[PDB]
């Protein structure tokens, strides 16, 4: 770490040629941040901060994560209440049962009431292709199945095909992320659905020290 | 800012907490409501009587049986630590909020100071 070399020579000798040759030889799995000296003079933060930011960009990290997702077309949705009215508070909504269909068969799932709340938020009806992540409990509405494409002869619906493979597919995901990416994520997180969050989202992403 | 970064302050905070797995909750409401609550640990079990504000906090936290919760007797704030392992089988997919933790050991009421 911290080794430095200088490509010294006259104009039109091959300094940039050697730099790009090094980049090509290293391969696409090794970070390579090109720069020019003039770009360091920012107007939002000190040039020292911009040098630090760019300097960290060239430290890549390869992190792998296995994720389990439930995806398919909804066939049934039968919310159930607790066996006793005294069991819970208010609505006293218990687990929900959802039926998903894929190219390889069907599966009946038992879901938490939080997952049911996510379903209600995403406005999912019978026949819609959905996508549930057991990692976080996040529900995504892919769209309507191509089977029901011609149900109505004029309707604004994003018809999507039936998911391939099994309903419950487990995949190992590998991504390369820079240290600066983590720094940005901590500095300017994208989470939050409050009005304050939206107002901050509309703001320009000015660099900060 | 650089100068103050080079000086550190070591501050001590004293915390009094009760943590344990709630066994049974029984609430009666007309007038104000009254109820009794039982919390157990790995080596203790106790029945407590709940005031109106404590019941209100319990309801607003939506606590159920088998949950490990922490109450600060100074303020009465109720925090849900997590769920027991025995309830893990009940679902195929789990929400982000759910957590599985063991039952705390020792005495129900504990005093702890943190620096």
């Amino acid at each position: 770490s911290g080794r430095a070399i200088l490509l010294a020579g006259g104009p039109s000798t091959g300094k940039t040629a050697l730099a790009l040759a090094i980049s090509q030889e290293l391969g696409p799995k090794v970070p390579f941040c090109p720069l020019v000296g003039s770009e360091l003079y920012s107007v939002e933060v000190k040039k020292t901060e911009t040098l630090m930011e760019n300097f960290r960009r060239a430290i890549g990290l390869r992190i792998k994560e296995t994720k389990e997702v439930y995806e398919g077309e909804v066939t049934e949705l039968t919310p159930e209440d607790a066996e006793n009215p005294l069991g819970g508070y208010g609505k006293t909504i218990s687990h929900v049962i959802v039926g998903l269909k894929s190219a390889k068969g069907t599966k009946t799932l038992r879901l938490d009431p939080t997952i049911y709340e996510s379903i209600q938020r995403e406005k999912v009806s019978i026949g819609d292709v959905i996508y549930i992540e057991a990692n976080t409990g996040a529900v995504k509405r892919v769209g309507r199945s191509d089977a029901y494409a011609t149900e109505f002869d004029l309707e604004t619906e994003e018809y999507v095909p039936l998911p391939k493979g099994e309903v419950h597919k487990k995949k190992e995901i590998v991504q390369d992320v820079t240290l600066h990416d983590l720094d940005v994520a901590n500095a300017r997180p994208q989470g939050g659905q409050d009005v304050i969050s939206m107002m901050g989202q509309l703001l320009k992403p000015k660099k900060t020290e | 800012q650089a100068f103050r970064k080079s000086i550190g302050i070591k501050i001590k905070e004293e915390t009094e907490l009760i943590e344990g797995e709630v066994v049974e909750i029984q609430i009666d409401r007309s007038g104000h409501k009254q109820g009794k609550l039982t919390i157990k640990t790995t080596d203790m079990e106790t029945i407590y009587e709940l005031g109106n504000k404590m019941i209100d906090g319990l309801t607003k936290e939506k606590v159920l049986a088998g949950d490990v919760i922490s109450i600060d007797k100074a303020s009465g704030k109720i925090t849900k630590l997590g769920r027991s392992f025995a309830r893990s089988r009940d679902y195929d997919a789990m929400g982000a909020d759910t957590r599985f933790v063991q039952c705390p050991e020792g005495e129900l009421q504990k005093r702890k100071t943190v620096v």
């Binding site: 006793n84 005294l86 819970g88 | 066994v23 049974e24 909750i25 609430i27 009666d28 049986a65």
Partner: peptide, 28 residues
């Protein structure tokens, strides 16, 4: 009251100042 009538005494003092189970839970 509007027809110049007094209110209930307990209600009067309460307004001047201002059983069955409903929820039972147990782990199976």
């Amino acid at each position: 009251d509007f027809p110049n009538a007094p209110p209930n005494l307990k209600d009067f003092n309460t307004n001047l100042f201002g059983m069955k189970t409903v929820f039972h839970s147990i782990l199976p």
